[PDB]
Design a protein around this ligand. Structure first.
Ligand SMILES: O=C1NCCc2[nH]c(-c3ccnc(-c4ccccc4F)c3)cc21
Length: 282
C-alpha cells in the first residue's frame, strides 16, 4: 500500500575495502577515467566514475541517484567520498554496461540490415528515459550517442543513458528541450547516417529519404525546430503513433548499418559537433 526506496548514502570508508579496483579503463570522459571494478562480496563487474567532489558534482550524483530507479537509465550502486590525490574525492559506482555506443553496435549487426520498426524501438526506449527525468523535473542536457550504451551484446539486450555531468533540476528560452533536440538528432542519424551541418536547412537525400512516410518525416521536424519552443514536448513526443506503437511500424529496410560502414572516418568529427550543438546550447 506504501513503498519508497533507499535514500542516497555517502559511504565514507575506502572503496578499496568494498571493491578491488582495476586500472583497465572503459569510459574516457569529463572528470577522469571510468575503471572496471569488481565487487568483493558478490564478485560482479562495475563502472567507476570518479569526481573532484565540489558542491556541483555533489548534486549531479544526487540526481543520477534519483534517476537510476529507471529501467533505461543507468543505475548507481554505490557512492563513496574518499581521499585520492589529497582531494576529498567522489567515487560513484554504477552498473557496468558491456554494450557499446548505441550506433557502434548496429554496424556489427552481422545478420540482415536495419528497420524503421527497429529504429522506433530504439528511439521509443530513449524517449521513455527522458520522460522519467522530465516526469521528475530533470534535464539531462547531454543526450549524445556516446551517452547511450547497452547492457550486453545480445539483441535481447537493452540500452541505458549515462553521464549526468550535465543534468540539472528544473526547480521552482528553456531547458528540458535540449533532450528533445537530441532525440531528433538521434532519430535522423538513426535513419540515414548523418546529421545536419552548421555551427537551418536539412535536406533529404534520395537513396535514403524516399518512400519513407512523411508521417515519420513529420516527427523529426517538430523535434528539430531550430526553435526552443514547439520543439514537441516529450509528453507530446510520446503521444504520436510511430513511437507509442511498439509493433505497427512498416518493416522498410534501412541502409544506416551499411551507411555507417561507409565513412567510418566521420565520427570523431560527429561526436564533437554533437557536443558542440549540445553542451554550449545555453
Ligand atoms: O557518467 C559518465 N560519464 C563519462 C562517460 C561515462 N561512461 C559511463 C559508463 C557507465 C556504465 N558502464 C560503462 C561501461 C561499462 C562496461 C563496458 C563499457 C562501458 F562503457 C560506462 C558513465 C559515464
Amino acid at each position: 500500500q506504501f513503498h519508497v526506496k533507499s535514500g542516497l548514502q555517502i559511504k565514507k570508508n575506502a572503496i578499496i575495502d568494498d571493491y578491488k579496483v582495476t586500472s583497465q579503463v572503459l569510459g574516457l570522459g569529463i572528470n577522469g577515467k571510468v575503471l572496471q571494478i569488481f565487487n568483493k562480496r558478490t564478485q560482479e563487474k562495475f563502472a567507476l566514475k570518479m569526481l573532484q567532489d565540489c558542491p556541483k558534482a555533489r548534486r549531479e550524483v544526487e540526481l543520477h541517484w534519483r534517476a537510476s530507479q529507471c529501467p533505461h537509465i543507468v543505475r548507481i550502486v554505490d557512492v563513496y567520498e574518499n581521499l585520492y590525490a589529497g582531494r576529498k574525492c567522489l567515487l560513484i559506482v554504477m552498473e557496468c554496461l558491456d554494450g557499446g555506443e548505441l550506433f557502434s553496435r548496429i554496424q556489427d549487426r552481422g545478420d540482415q540490415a536495419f528497420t524503421e520498426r527497429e529504429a522506433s524501438e530504439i528511439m521509443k526506449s530513449i524517449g521513455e528515459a527522458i520522460q522519467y527525468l522530465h516526469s521528475i523535473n530533470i534535464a539531462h542536457r547531454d543526450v549524445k550517442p556516446e551517452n547511450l550504451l547497452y547492457t550486453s551484446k545480445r539483441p535481447n539486450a537493452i540500452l541505458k543513458l549515462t553521464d549526468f555531468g550535465f543534468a540539472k533540476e528544473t526547480t521552482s528560452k528553456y531547458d528540458k528541450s535540449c533532450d528533445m533536440w537530441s532525440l531528433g538528432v538521434i532519430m535522423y542519424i538513426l535513419l540515414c547516417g548523418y546529421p545536419p551541418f552548421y555551427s537551418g536547412q536539412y535536406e533529404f537525400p534520395n537513396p535514403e529519404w524516399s518512400e519513407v512516410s512523411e508521417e515519420v518525416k513529420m516527427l523529426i521536424r517538430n523535434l528539430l525546430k531550430t526553435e526552443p519552443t514547439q520543439r514537441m514536448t516529450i509528453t507530446e513526443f510520446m503521444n504520436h503513433p510511430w513511437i507509442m506503437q511498439s509493433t505497427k511500424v512498416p518493416q522498410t529496410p534501412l541502409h544506416t548499418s551499411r551507411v555507417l560502414k561507409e565513412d567510418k572516418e566521420r565520427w570523431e568529427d560527429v561526436k564533437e559537433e554533437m557536443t558542440s550543438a549540445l553542451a554550449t546550447m545555453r
